[PDB]
Amino acid sequence: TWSYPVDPYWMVALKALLVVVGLLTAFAFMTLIERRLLARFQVRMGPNRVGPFGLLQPLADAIKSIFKEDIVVAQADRFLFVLAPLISVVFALLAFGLIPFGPPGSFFGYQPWVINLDLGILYLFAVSELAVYGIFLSGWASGSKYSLLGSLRSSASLISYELGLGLALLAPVLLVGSLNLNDIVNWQKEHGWLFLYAFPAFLVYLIASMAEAARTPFDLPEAEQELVGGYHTEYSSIKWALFQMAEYIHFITASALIPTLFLGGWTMPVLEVPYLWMFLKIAFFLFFFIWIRATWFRLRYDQLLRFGWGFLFPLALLWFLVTALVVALDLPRTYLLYLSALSFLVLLGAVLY
């Protein structure tokens, strides 16, 4: 925050609240869109009933949800069962704040973000650990071990790739030289589109985000069809809704973060209207990810650990040292345009034999 202003604490608050409830309506309507987009992929139709577009069905659903009877299991730790859903949502919502959707002053006088800070990615990392805390904790809190085991599979896997995200994030930091999202973005304004320079790390970041419930590992798990996922399976009315809510906000936070960092989110080469583009990129990754949600198999997490731990993460720190070598010896930043382009040429061509 060398170059960027601060709105008064009341306005920071108000913006925070707007972003939270905005994220509420966001998650619900996103559930509708994925329902139907999936329906198109599998050549059926969505829910038009309880319409008009079918888009009043989160009202109906939320309405079921509350008035549903929130059940607290005995044989569940009384304090932890309640507290668990609380944690998972709190640490999910926060840190979508940081993401700038526009230049300063452009919020109608103020600030497209909520908070910016000076240490950016670390905040994200920090908040990311704590949701997982919520996961394995709920697994305990429920005090059904069937729930536990799954929560443990979950946590082990998540934590694995969660490590992956860091060594992913190292490379682009070298180039920009800042821990701030606005600076990274602006770096992409001038030198342009970090994934041009950073590509392998782009790959390992994205796929690292597969672990965080994104689908294609999925021995996350959802309880479905396996040794269950754990955390949900013991909760009913509001609390269950809270867990689902958190996992989805994380999904869109990631769909925002991917353009924000490696691409130029907002801050596109041309047109450069402030909000619309970040929402569009969000939409792009969101849709592509939904395709991923539908159209690919599971890992078992035996493999998922193999894939992230054995493949993604070593690959991640390998590229870091390369970009470290390049930035340390100051050569040009061109060598990374060339290198990333070339590595992309490799990591693609070996698919089509």
Partner 1 sequence: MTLNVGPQHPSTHGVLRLMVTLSGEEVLEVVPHIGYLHTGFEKTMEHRTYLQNITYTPRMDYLHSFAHDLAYALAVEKLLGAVVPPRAETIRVILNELSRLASHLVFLGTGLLDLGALTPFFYAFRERETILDLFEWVTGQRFHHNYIRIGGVKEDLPEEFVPELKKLLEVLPHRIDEYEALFAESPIFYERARGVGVIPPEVAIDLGLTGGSLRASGVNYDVRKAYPYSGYETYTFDVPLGERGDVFDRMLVRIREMRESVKIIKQALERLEPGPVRDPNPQITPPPRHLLETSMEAVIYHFKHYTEGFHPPKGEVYVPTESARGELGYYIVSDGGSMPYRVKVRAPSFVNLQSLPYACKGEQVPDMVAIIASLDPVMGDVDR
Partner 2 sequence: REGILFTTLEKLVAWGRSNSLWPATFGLACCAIEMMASTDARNDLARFGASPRQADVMIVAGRLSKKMAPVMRRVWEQMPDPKWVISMGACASSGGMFNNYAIVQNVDSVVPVDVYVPGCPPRPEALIYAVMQLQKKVRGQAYNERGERLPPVAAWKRTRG
Partner 3 sequence: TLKALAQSLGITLKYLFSKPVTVPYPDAPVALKPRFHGRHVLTRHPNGLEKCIGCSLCAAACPAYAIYVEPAENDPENPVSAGERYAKVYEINMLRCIFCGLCEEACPTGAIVLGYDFEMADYEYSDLVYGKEDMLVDVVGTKPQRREAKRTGKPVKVGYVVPYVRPELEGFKAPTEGGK
Q: State which of residues 6, 13, 17, 71 lies at the interface with partner 2 (CB under 8 A).
A: 71
40 lies in the binding site for partner 3 (CB under 8 A): yes
CA 176, CA 332: separation in Å to the nearest integer?
13
Contacts with partner 2 in 46-65 (CB under 8 A)?
Answer: 46-50, 54, 57, 59-64
Q: State which of residues 5, 17, 41, 63 lies at the interface with partner 3 (CB under 8 A).
A: 41
| Stretch 257-296: interaction string toward partner 3, x if CB under 8 A | ----------------------------------x--xxx
299 lies in the binding site for partner 1 (CB under 8 A): yes
CA angle centred on 266, ends 264 and 271, rounded to 5°: 105
- Preceding amide of 52 cis, omega within 30: yes
Q: Which 3 state secondary structure label does DSSP give 54? A: coil
Tokens of 298: 């599971």
**Stretch (H or E) spanning 39:** helix 9-41
| Stretch 42-71: interaction string toward partner 1, x if CB under 8 A | xxx---------------------------
**Which one, 39 or 80, has the nearer CB to partner 3?**
39
CA 249, CA 29: separation in Å to the nearest integer?
12
CA 47, CA 40: separation in Å to the nearest integer?
12
48 lies in the binding site for partner 3 (CB under 8 A): yes
DSSP 8-state symbol, 348 = H
* Segment near partner 2 (CB under 8 A); pick from 230-238, 273-281, 302-310, 323-331: 230-238
Minimum CB–partner distance for residue 297 and partner 1 (Å) = 4
53 lies in the binding site for partner 3 (CB under 8 A): no
Which residues 6+ apart lie within 8 Å of 71 measured at CB?
235, 236, 237
| Stretch 214-233: interaction string toward partner 3, x if CB under 8 A | --------------------
The option from partner 3, partner 2, partner 1, none interacting with 298 (CB < 5 to 8 A, set by class) reads partner 1
The option from partner 3, partner 1, partner 2, none interacting with 54 (CB < 5 to 8 A, set by class) reads partner 2
Contacts with partner 2 in 29-48 (CB under 8 A)?
Answer: 35, 44-48
Tokens of 16: 């925070």
- Nearest Cα neighbor of 97 from 281, 253, 284 is 253
- Nearest Cα neighbor of 57 from 82, 85, 28 is 28
**Which one, 296 or 338, has the nearer CB to partner 3?**
296
Tokens of 194: 């970090």
236 lies in the binding site for partner 2 (CB under 8 A): yes
**Which one, 134 or 221, has the nearer CB to partner 1?**
221
24 lies in the binding site for partner 2 (CB under 8 A): no
Tokens of 4: 């960027």
Which residues 6+ apart lie within 8 Å of 186 measured at CB?
267
Contact 340, 199 (CB under 8 A): yes
344 lies in the binding site for partner 3 (CB under 8 A): no
- Nearest Cα neighbor of 77 from 134, 135, 138 is 138
CA 320 to chain centre: 22
Contacting positions for partner 2 (CB under 8 A): 35, 44-50, 54, 57, 59-64, 67-69, 71, 223-224, 232-237, 240
Contacting positions for partner 3 (CB under 8 A): 37, 40-45, 48, 291, 294-296, 350-353
Contacting positions for partner 1 (CB under 8 A): 38, 41-44, 146, 149, 215, 218-219, 221, 223-228, 294-303
